[PDB]
């Protein structure tokens, strides 16, 4: 909850900028608001910058990152379950067994 709040605010800021630029585009195209060759040209240049990194090398690296964290998470969950198993057997050897 406290770790993704700075990202949520950053994304909200980005979303505002994206919405303001989009509204400028529609205002220009619909009419009334003054047409500009240069600004809409840069908005076109901004549209062509999406998606950022679609190469196969980046896909291999992104999924390498994701599998590394995934494997690490699996080993961490194994450690926690090893501890939970240890608690259970420690108590089972006292109640259901005489050591």
């Amino acid at each position: 909850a406290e770790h993704l709040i700075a990202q949520h605010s950053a994304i909200k800021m980005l979303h505002s900028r994206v919405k303001l630029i989009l509204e400028y585009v529609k205002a220009s195209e619909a009419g009334e608001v003054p047409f500009n060759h240069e600004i809409l040209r840069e908005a076109y240049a901004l549209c062509h910058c999406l998606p950022v990194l679609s190469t196969d090398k980046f896909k291999t690296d992104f999924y390498d990152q994701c599998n590394d964290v995934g494997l690490m998470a699996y080993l961490g969950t194994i450690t926690k379950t090893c501890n939970t198993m240890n608690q259970f057997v420690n108590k089972f050897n006292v109640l259901y067994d005489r050591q």
Binding site: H3, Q7, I11, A73, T79, K80, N83
Partner: protein
């Protein structure tokens, strides 16, 4: 004042403490909650020996009216840096160092169960939890970036 710059980065939260010592011979009173931190095995002995010889102060921060204004105006552009953090590889060697320690801790917790300090496995489990939780948060930021900038198309 003591600061851990490495854990600041990995946890995404400032890791700072302010401390004052007790005079030689003087004993602290009853109440001492002690907020838990993972201490590596090469430091834990010394930590335990001296942990009751001092106390922690309640830390808070402040800024000026101009700092307030300037930081809001800085944010109007500094948001870009939050969506381009790349925290998983900036200080990678830390998490790999912690895992090494965690492994040796687990070796000691296995030796505790062997035949026959207060439950080393639970401590090691909380350490592995913390390290993993930090790693998954890193992946969360990476996936967020992938969702925002890569999955758009023409």
């Amino acid at each position: 004042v003591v600061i851990d710059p490495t854990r600041t980065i990995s946890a995404g939260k400032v890791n700072l403490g302010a401390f004052r010592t007790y005079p030689k011979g003087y004993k602290p009173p009853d109440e001492g909650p002690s907020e838990y931190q993972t201490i590596p095995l090469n430091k834990i002995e010394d930590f335990g020996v001296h942990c009751k010889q001092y106390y922690a102060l309640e830390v808070s921060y402040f800024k000026s009216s101009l700092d307030r204004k300037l930081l809001e105006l800085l944010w109007n552009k500094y948001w870009v840096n939050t969506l381009s953090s790349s925290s998983l590889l900036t200080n990678a060697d830390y998490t790999t160092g912690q895992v090494f320690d965690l492994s040796e801790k687990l070796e000691q917790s296995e030796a505790q169960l062997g035949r026959g300090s207060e439950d080393k496995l639970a401590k090691a489990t909380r350490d592995s939890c913390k390290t993993t939780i930090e790693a998954i948060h890193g992946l969360m930021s990476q996936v967020i970036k992938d969702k925002l900038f890569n999955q758009i198309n023409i």
